């Protein structure tokens, strides 16, 4: 029977950078909540879990994932220079899914300390409804109490311990200066709700209550952002902001249940709510390893209810799983329970085949709440054979903990969607299964397709023949073979045997050596023997079809494209192109936000290289971008040329 309801629940996240007190912050938050992935804790009767957001921006996979994982967010800012760059870059995404914020303003107490300025920012940049719930008093040494806007009292604080706090009320001076903010405050959530709107103009006095109802109701909707004030590392308002999670942050039950479709048919939205009656389903956001326990699989679970020592389905990967006991990491301890409830957050131990982003439901049903491709890669070469066991070691594992990655034996080669994540799984090498090993160039990975079509019959003379017709495919439809046989000169024991000698084939590649793709094959005929002909001569000549098909075929290699979003001031506006038409880019549509223009873009992964560099040089500190994967393009005659000649 669960400590806690739903409607008890707080589901939260720490969206911050590091300079605006990160790390301070939370421990201040584990602590205050006391007695890794995910920390189960508890504020005022309140169950509240605190999910580790991912260390950088540039991955997008996790912070989406972390993004659906929690319910609501708090947003730290330093009181000097306000937001930055990456934290609105996770902003703008945590509305994508809709995730209400309560903002922070951390770091009061030190310089150029400027409260009602960082507000400005997140009108400014972020074009964000947000006003202060509290105000401070003085600045930087001066900083002393806080005025709590919507109750309207203040808090005065003696110590660096955030201990005897003095519960006053309003001195003079600043009993103005608090009049007008709170009436700043109430209408812009009157913005918002209709018949407070009579009420304010009306000149009804507003309760604090009443009052309160309101807000919660603009921030679990997401149309306004309270916001707080205090310094993390000397103790002053992270308890008021505690309670400000309670108050307004989303439980469960507040925000809109997680779309998904079915195992078969993936087109259908799949509900999923928090309900203990329904069947359970839940979602693994992290794998680790305990030099003890095993496996460690964090999960959270949307609908239904779970038992520990029962048997469900990994619905992702399609198998059976049997759970284990469940454990819960705590700010300082370790808990075990057999029943996981909705809207809760536990490991499980000892799950063999799990890994990230696979969706954990009943046995009868079919659900799954989540869904990769290489374009740049590396080398990587460990000394003696000592090190070269131990990587080929962690290969197996960090698959299970990250699938975005490309394992190649032919040196060992791993692709990946960029030179971070290439690096964080490099680092993981390195240092946390200590391997010592060279480390090769960022390498784009070409492809190669055909521009025209054929039909070629290669012939091993042991025996073997085909007849296929090769034609060029719809970009990025992938590969699809066509068995148009019918009379059987090919008898169906060897066909498939084809297929492979085909793929096997083609990964090599035709013409730099770079794997052919975008390419259909179809077998209209052949010839066999019923004792020279092999499974072996019918994929040499599969091969061999291939290769009089790259003659006649137009061969070409293709580089990868990515979509560019620059973000800048207009009066560089001229530049950044100048640079982008440089970089062989091309610029598609473009539309304002806010202040600034947000420039889309088009540009080959082999000339990004370098990019931030020339991003700062140009606008002086004040441009940003972003990028990911498009589209496959054929590379430039006289570029193509080179990379022959190179490779040959």
Not at 288 to 298: C, E, H, I, R, S
Not at 399 to 422: K, R
Request: charged share 25%; aromatic share 8%.
């Amino acid at each position: 029977a669960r400590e806690f309801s739903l409607e008890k629940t707080r589901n939260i996240g720490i969206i911050a950078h590091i300079d605006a007190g990160k790390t301070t912050t939370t421990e201040r938050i584990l602590y205050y909540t006391g007695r890794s992935a995910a920390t189960t804790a508890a504020w005022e009767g309140h169950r509240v879990n605190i999910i580790d957001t991912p260390g950088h921006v540039d991955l997008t996979v996790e912070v989406e994932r972390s993004l659906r994982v929690l319910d609501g967010a708090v947003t730290v800012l330093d009181a000097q220079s306000g937001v930055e760059p990456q934290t609105e870059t996770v902003w703008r995404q945590a509305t994508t899914y809709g995730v209400p914020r309560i903002v922070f303003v951390n770091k009061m107490d030190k310089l150029g300390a400027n409260f009602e300025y960082s507000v400005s920012t997140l009108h400014d940049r972020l074009q964000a409804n947000a006003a202060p719930i509290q105000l401070p008093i003085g600045a930087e040494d001066e900083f002393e109490a806080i005025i709590d806007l919507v109750e309207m009292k203040c808090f005065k604080y003696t110590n660096d311990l955030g201990t005897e706090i003095e519960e006053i009320e309003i001195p003079e001076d600043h009993l103005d200066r608090a009049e007008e903010a709170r009436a700043s405050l109430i209408e812009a959530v009157a913005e918002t709700s209709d018949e407070l709107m009579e009420k304010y103009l009306g000149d009804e006095e507003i309760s604090v209550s009443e009052l309160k109802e309101a807000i919660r109701q603009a921030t679990t909707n997401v149309e306004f952002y309270p916001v707080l004030c205090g310094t993390a590392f000397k103790n002053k308002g992270v308890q008021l902001m505690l309670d400000a999670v309670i108050d307004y942050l989303p439980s469960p039950l507040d925000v809109k249940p997680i779309i998904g479709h079915r195992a078969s048919n993936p087109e259908e939205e799949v509900i999923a709510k928090a309900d203990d009656s329904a069947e359970f389903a839940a979602l693994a956001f992290k794998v680790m390893t305990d030099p003890y326990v095993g496996k460690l699989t964090f999960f959270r679970v949307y609908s239904g209810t779970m038992t520990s020592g029962s048997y469900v389905k990994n619905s992702t990967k399609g198998k059976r799983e049997r759970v284990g006991r469940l454990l819960q990491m705590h700010a300082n301890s370790r808990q075990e329970i057999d029943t996981v409830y909705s809207g809760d957050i536990a490991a499980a131990v000892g799950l063999k085949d799990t890994g990230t982003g696979d969706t954990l439901c009943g046995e009868k049903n079919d659900i799954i709440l989540e869904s990769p491709e290489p374009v740049i890669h590396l080398s990587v070469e460990p000394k003696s054979k000592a090190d070269q066991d131990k990587m080929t070691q962690a290969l197996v594992k960090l698959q299970e903990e990250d699938p975005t990655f490309h394992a190649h034996t032919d040196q060992v080669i791993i692709g990946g969607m960029g030179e971070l994540h290439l690096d964080i799984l490099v680092d993981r090498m390195k240092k946390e299964f200590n391997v010592e090993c060279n480390v090769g160039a960022p390498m784009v990975s070409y492809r190669e397709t055909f521009k025209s079509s054929a039909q070629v019959q290669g012939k091993f003379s042991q025996y073997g023949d085909v007849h296929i017709e090769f034609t060029p495919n719809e970009t990025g439809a992938g590969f699809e073979f066509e068995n148009a046989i019918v009379g059987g000169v090919v008898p169906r024991e060897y066909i498939p045997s084809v297929e492979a000698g085909l793929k096997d084939a083609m990964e090599n590649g035709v013409l730099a050596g770079y794997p052919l793709i975008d390419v259909k094959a179809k077998l209209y005929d052949g010839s066999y023997h019923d004792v020279d002909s092999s499974e072996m001569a019918f994929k040499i000549a599969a091969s061999l079809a291939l290769k009089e098909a790259a003659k006649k075929c137009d061969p070409v290699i293709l580089e990868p494209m990515m979509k560019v979003t620059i973000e800048m001031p207009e009066e560089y506006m001229g530049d950044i192109m100048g640079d982008v038409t440089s970089r062989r880019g091309r610029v598609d549509g473009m539309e304002p936000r806010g202040n600034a223009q947000v420039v889309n873009a088009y540009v080959p992964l082999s000339e990004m290289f370098g990019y931030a560099t020339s991003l700062r040089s140009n606008t002086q500190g004040r441009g940003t971008y972003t990028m990911y994967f498009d589209h496959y393009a054929e590379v430039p005659k006289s570029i193509a040329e080179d990379i022959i000649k190179k490779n040959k």
